[PDB]
Amino acid sequence: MIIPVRCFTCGKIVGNKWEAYLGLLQAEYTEGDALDALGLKRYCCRRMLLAHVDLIEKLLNYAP
Amino acid sequence: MIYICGECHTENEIKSRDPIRCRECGYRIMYKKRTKRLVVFDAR
């Protein structure tokens, strides 16, 4: 539902990078470039952002 | 005790053995208010 704070395998901090990923993609950077610029390299830390579905933005549509 | 309407979220004290309806909204689904005794968690 929300980006995890740590990669499950390494332990590298991945939580703060979510907004940036959307922005780089928005800028039209190709996905491969965006991930590298964020600096993730190992293919265990790239799976974190590449395969994340953000469900928290759809539970904010229901009035409290 | 104190109940919360299911539509307008306006708290209203319902007395024992009394019909279940809101006020200013006329609604019939009530949610009980969260307790005030405190419970502690672990980040683990």
């Binding site: 539902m1 980006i3 703060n16 409290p64 | 968690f41 980040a43």
Partner: protein
Amino acid sequence: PYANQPTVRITELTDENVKFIIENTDLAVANSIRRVFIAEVPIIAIDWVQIDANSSVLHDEFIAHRLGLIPLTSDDIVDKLQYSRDCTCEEFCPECSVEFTLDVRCNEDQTRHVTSRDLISNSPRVIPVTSDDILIVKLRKGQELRLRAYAKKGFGKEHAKWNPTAGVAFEYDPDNALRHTVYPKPEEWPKSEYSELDEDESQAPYDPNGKPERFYYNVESCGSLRPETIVLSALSGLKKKLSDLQTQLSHEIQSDV
């Protein structure tokens, strides 16, 4: 029948990783200090949460879990803190704890991000790593959150929130001079980063009376400790384990009579 004279040589040094090389030692010692960077280096982290009002989307035990994995600056004051099970105080005291506090309320219509810039502490030595911002939860107009947390001291055998390191690389013998591993077709394998072979060779020639030396390390860090004090605190922690076991032993073969 005695020890060795290992020699260290650092290659890189940044604020998030160290590359070095340990020559002239045994494989068992070069590995036993690879498991100490991970498990037995002490560090600070949150371990006690109490929620007063949570009307967000995530339940109470979701937020109590995303808080413990936030890394706190544990640079210098980890050596002054007792273990809360050893300290002679009550449940908590400023000698074995650090108290945090969060309180956020959303009033405007635009959504609100509850980052880690809201964790407000009392001791100016331990703060979350901000000197971007880790996201904790998002709030809608009319929702709020407020809590109190304490941050204890421990290491990585308790819980994986107390280890101070990301991936820890390690490798030795970049070419199969010892044939510890056996390739079926040695031509399809990429050449290692540390290799010294030619561009048209696959393995070094086999030598039977060999022994593994010159181990290569690369230690990253999550943000709590500097990458060079993760190593200094590991060697100083492993030495103090053997030094304490030798006490119990000599206390046993002395009470043998």
